[PDB]
Amino acid sequence: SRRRVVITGMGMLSPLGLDVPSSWEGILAGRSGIAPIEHMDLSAYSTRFGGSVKGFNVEEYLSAKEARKLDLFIQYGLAASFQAVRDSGLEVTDANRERIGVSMGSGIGGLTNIENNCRSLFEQGPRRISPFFVPGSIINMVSGFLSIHLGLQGPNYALTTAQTTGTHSIGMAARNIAYGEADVMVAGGSEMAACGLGLGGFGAARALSTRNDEPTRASRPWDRDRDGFVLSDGSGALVLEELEHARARGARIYAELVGFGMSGDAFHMTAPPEDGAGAARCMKNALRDAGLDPRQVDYINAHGTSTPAGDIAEIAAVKSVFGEHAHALSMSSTKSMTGHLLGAAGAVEAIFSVLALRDQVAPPTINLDNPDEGCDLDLVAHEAKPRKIDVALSNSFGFGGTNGTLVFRRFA
Amino acid sequence: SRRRVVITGMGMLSPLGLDVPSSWEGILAGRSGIAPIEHMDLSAYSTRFGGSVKGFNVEEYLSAKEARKLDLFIQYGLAASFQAVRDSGLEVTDANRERIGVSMGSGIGGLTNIENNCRSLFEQGPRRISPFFVPGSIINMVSGFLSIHLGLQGPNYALTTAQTTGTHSIGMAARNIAYGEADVMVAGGSEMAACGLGLGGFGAARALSTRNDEPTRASRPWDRDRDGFVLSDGSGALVLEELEHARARGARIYAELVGFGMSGDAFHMTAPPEDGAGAARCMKNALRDAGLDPRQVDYINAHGTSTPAGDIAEIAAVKSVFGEHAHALSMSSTKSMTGHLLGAAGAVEAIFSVLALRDQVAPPTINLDNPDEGCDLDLVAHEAKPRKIDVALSNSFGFGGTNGTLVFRRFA
Numbered sequence: 005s006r007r008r009v010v011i012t013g014m015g016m017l018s019p020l021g022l023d024v025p026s027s028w029e030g031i032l033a034g035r036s037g038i039a040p041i042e043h044m045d046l047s048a049y050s051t052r053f054g055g056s057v058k059g060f061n062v063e064e065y066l067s068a069k070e071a072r073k074l075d076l077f078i079q080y081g082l083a084a085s086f087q088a089v090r091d092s093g094l095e096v097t098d099a100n101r102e103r104i105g106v107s108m109g110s111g112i113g114g115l116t117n118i119e120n121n122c123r124s125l126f127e128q129g130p131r132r133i134s135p136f137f138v139p140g141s142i143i144n145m146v147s148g149f150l151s152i153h154l155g156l157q158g159p160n161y162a163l164t165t166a167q168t169t170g171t172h173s174i175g176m177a178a179r180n181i182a183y184g185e186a187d188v189m190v191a192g193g194s195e196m197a198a199c200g201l202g203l204g205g206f207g208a209a210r211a212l213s214t215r216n217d218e219p220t221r222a223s224r225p226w227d228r229d230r231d232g233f234v235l236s237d238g239s240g241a242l243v244l245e246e247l248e249h250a251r252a253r254g255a256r257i258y259a260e261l262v263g264f265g266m267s268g269d270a271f272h273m274t275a276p277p278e279d280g281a282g283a284a285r286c287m288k289n290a291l292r293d294a295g296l297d298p299r300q301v302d303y304i305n306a307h308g309t310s311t312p313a314g315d316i317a318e319i320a321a322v323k324s325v326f327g328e329h330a331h332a333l334s335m336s337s338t339k340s341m342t343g344h345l346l347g348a349a350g351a352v353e354a355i356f357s358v359l360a361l362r363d364q365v366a367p368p369t370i371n372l373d374n375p376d377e378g379c380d381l382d383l384v385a386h387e388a389k390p391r392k393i394d395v396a397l398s399n400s401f402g403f404g405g406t407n408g409t410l411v412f413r414r415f416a
Numbered sequence: 417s418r419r420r421v422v423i424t425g426m427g428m429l430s431p432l433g434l435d436v437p438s439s440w441e442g443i444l445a446g447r448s449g450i451a452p453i454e455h456m457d458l459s460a461y462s463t464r465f466g467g468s469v470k471g472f473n474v475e476e477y478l479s480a481k482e483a484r485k486l487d488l489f490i491q492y493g494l495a496a497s498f499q500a501v502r503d504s505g506l507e508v509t510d511a512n513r514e515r516i517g518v519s520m521g522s523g524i525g526g527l528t529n530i531e532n533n534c535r536s537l538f539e540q541g542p543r544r545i546s547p548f549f550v551p552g553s554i555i556n557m558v559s560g561f562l563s564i565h566l567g568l569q570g571p572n573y574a575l576t577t578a579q580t581t582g583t584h585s586i587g588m589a590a591r592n593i594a595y596g597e598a599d600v601m602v603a604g605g606s607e608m609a610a611c612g613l614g615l616g617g618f619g620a621a622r623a624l625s626t627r628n629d630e631p632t633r634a635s636r637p638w639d640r641d642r643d644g645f646v647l648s649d650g651s652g653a654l655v656l657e658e659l660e661h662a663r664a665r666g667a668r669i670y671a672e673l674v675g676f677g678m679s680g681d682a683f684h685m686t687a688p689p690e691d692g693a694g695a696a697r698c699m700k701n702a703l704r705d706a707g708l709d710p711r712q713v714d715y716i717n718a719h720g721t722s723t724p725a726g727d728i729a730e731i732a733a734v735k736s737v738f739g740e741h742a743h744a745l746s747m748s749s750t751k752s753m754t755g756h757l758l759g760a761a762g763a764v765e766a767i768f769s770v771l772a773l774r775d776q777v778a779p780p781t782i783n784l785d786n787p788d789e790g791c792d793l794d795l796v797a798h799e800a801k802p803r804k805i806d807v808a809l810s811n812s813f814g815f816g817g818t819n820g821t822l823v824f825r826r827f828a
């Protein structure tokens with residue numbers, strides 16, 4: 005048998021806002037968080053824009069001294085996690101601290117720290133590398149720092165499955181609780197790869213939209229004029245909680261996490277297969293996990309990266325999985341507004357999926373001016389759509405052909 | 417309901433050899449794999465030695481063309497994965513490809529590659545960044561590339577939990593099989609952190625031994641003259657397999673994986689607590705998971721990094737878990753010979769723990785000339801000790817206070 009898992013707290017930094025309600029307000033308004041990147045020389049770069057976190061104040065969370073030790077991705081991870089725990093009302097005690105764990109991940113980790121320490125290294129040699137370089141840059145330090153700050157002694161780990169990280173982190177945290185290895189988990193991911201290395205790295209693979217003239221129109225999933233993904237920064241964290249543990253302390257329950265699917269394409273290092281066979285297997289695995297029929301799905305938060313191959317594969321995968329119901333569900337890419345937070349994409353999009361359930365509204369796919377060949381599904385073009393949503397899927401399909409799907413259902 | 421998990425295949429690059437048998441021969445012979453580093457000028461560094469992989473031929477596994485796109489840690493991860501799969505005798509088919517997954521982790525991932533591309537960016541501009549920078553450097557691409565080469569469509573993910581990565585990777589892969597998410601998993605980790613930022617970063621933290629004039633004597637777990645860990649490179653991979661699946665195909669079974677434990681210290685970003693309270697919680701979780709009397713434990717492969725605080729914390733944790741039986745079991749650190757492979761430490765040491773079971777021998781702790789205050793257990797000083805081993809435990813502890821324990825026993 006298996007215990008049920010609910011969402012009792014959510015936290016976020018995104019290009020739309022410094023918390024969940026501000027981000028969600030921008031999502032439902034169709035607002036873009038995309039703009040040229042500042043305080044950075046991007047002259048020799050073919051992409052000069054992205055989703056930055058605007059006006060983040062780390063000292064709401066940490067002392068200036070402890071923040072100086074930590075890469076921005078870790079700072080963002082901690083901000084979302086601290087928000088999620090506060091949002092949950094959970095009280096950590098000697099009686100429960102061994103049952104409360106953390107799985108906060110990242111796709112690329114501490115590129116900003118690596119960049120700045122490389123500067124020191126090359127210019128002045130190794131003795132100028134920060135003593136906190138390693139612990140302040142490695143991906144497990146959101147889980148590490150959070151556990152130390154709150155006294156969490158439950159399972160303590162971090163995933164790194166590129167653009168699938170956040171989805172896998174939440175799913176595997178849910179499994180921890182279901183199989184009785186924990187009663188509470190903080191899970192999600194964080195990312196800050198709007199360094200030269202991130203824009204240069206993805207830029208070198210010509211993976212990025214180069215629509216520098218109109219950065220807010222760059223991310224246009226399933227639009228015939230799309231030219232690659234938009235790089236974005238931020239974090240999402242959820243408090244996952246066993247249902248009876250949640251009910252006993254009178255927690256506010258946003259939604260139930262009913263399904264987790266994983267698969268590998270085993271196809272290509274960066275490109276999905278044309279027919280989305282891997283994403284189809286993963287969605288089917290998630291629905292089977294949830295004991296649900298494809299007909300019961302109302303809302304999908306797509307991966308929807310605005311890459312020509314990625315977008316088309318996801319249409320193929322949804323038609324294959326959902327057959328005569330594929331047009332009845334609504335599917336949207338919130339990456340049309342946020343851009344692609346890579347390892348954090350799955351975390352913030354799980355939150356948007358839970359909020360679609362709370363508010364009975366499908367977030368828009370903005371910039372869908374001219375759907376491409378075969379993009380004839382309900383993709384919620386331009387504006388939010390109020391509707392019945394009992395069951396919401398969130399998909400993540402990343403490099404190495406690693407796929408994740410989460411199934412959320414209304415709780416009452 | 418929970419299925420049993422056996423080891424059918426193992427693979428390894430270590431400072432002692434280019435496979436498991438050659439590495440194991442070194443272990444039983446008390447040979448050091450530590451030598452001054454030759455692959456770069458370390459004259460400006462306070463540490464100029466480590467455990468390098470010697471004579472690695474990537475063209476035993478991959479085309480030179482593919483290898484040139486991949487960081488050494490991915491090459492090392494693929495080499496150990498391919499060895500483990502071949503050693504398993506398992507044949508991938510349309511019938512089973514969806515039931516075979518991979519969880520190969522790293523602490524740091526492609527630091528060398530990211531450093532080299534940082535150098536190109538700074539000296540020459542962003543147009544010199546490799547288009548293979550991201551897929552050739554990020555941690556999930558051991559899992560990704562292995563799945564692509566072998567056609568593995570099961571759960572596809574990667575852990576990054578610093579020096580606990582290998583242990584966590586193996587443990588959670590076992591859980592995937594135990595719970596029915598997969599019948600086979602390739603699990604372990606790989607590390608190549610021996611670049612400027614790696615030796616420089618650990619150097620800046622004053623974490624590394626500085627015994628440059630006698631590198632083979634540098635790693636001296638529990639010795640009163642120890643002065644930090646020795647940085648080492650390589651990979652460990654194991655094929656984990658549901659027991660009936662293994663029996664059904666006539667697989668050679670090395671041992672059964674009966675116990676996995678995790679805990680957080682919630683103590684310090686980098687320092688283990690002196691009393692080993694988190695290590696003790698972790699081992700107790702693992703032993704309860706295995707349904708064992710602690711007195712059943714015959715052999716512990718310690719974390720045994722050769723840091724003052726780490727080594728002593730482990731004696732304290734073992735004494736607290738095992739009481740008087742702490743004086744009956746054998747505990748050794750193979751890090752005395754291999755050094756600290758960081759994210760791969762848990763992977764190679766799980767293999768040494770299985771081979772301890774197959775051959776009925778406790779590997780030595782070499783260089784244990786003067787055991788420190790309170791280091792009065794059977795630490796297998798100097799020479800391999802043939803003895804009865806029914807149950808073997810492998811411990812890892814990492815930055816973020818992250819703890820993993822694996823419990824193996826003989827299978828009949």
Ligand SMILES: CC(=O)Nc1ccc(CC(N)=O)cc1
Pocket residue numbers: 484485543544545546547548
């Ligand atoms: C394996 C390979 O073809 N590497 C590669 C590295 C760097 C670049 C960027 C450049 N213009 O030189 C392009 C390609």
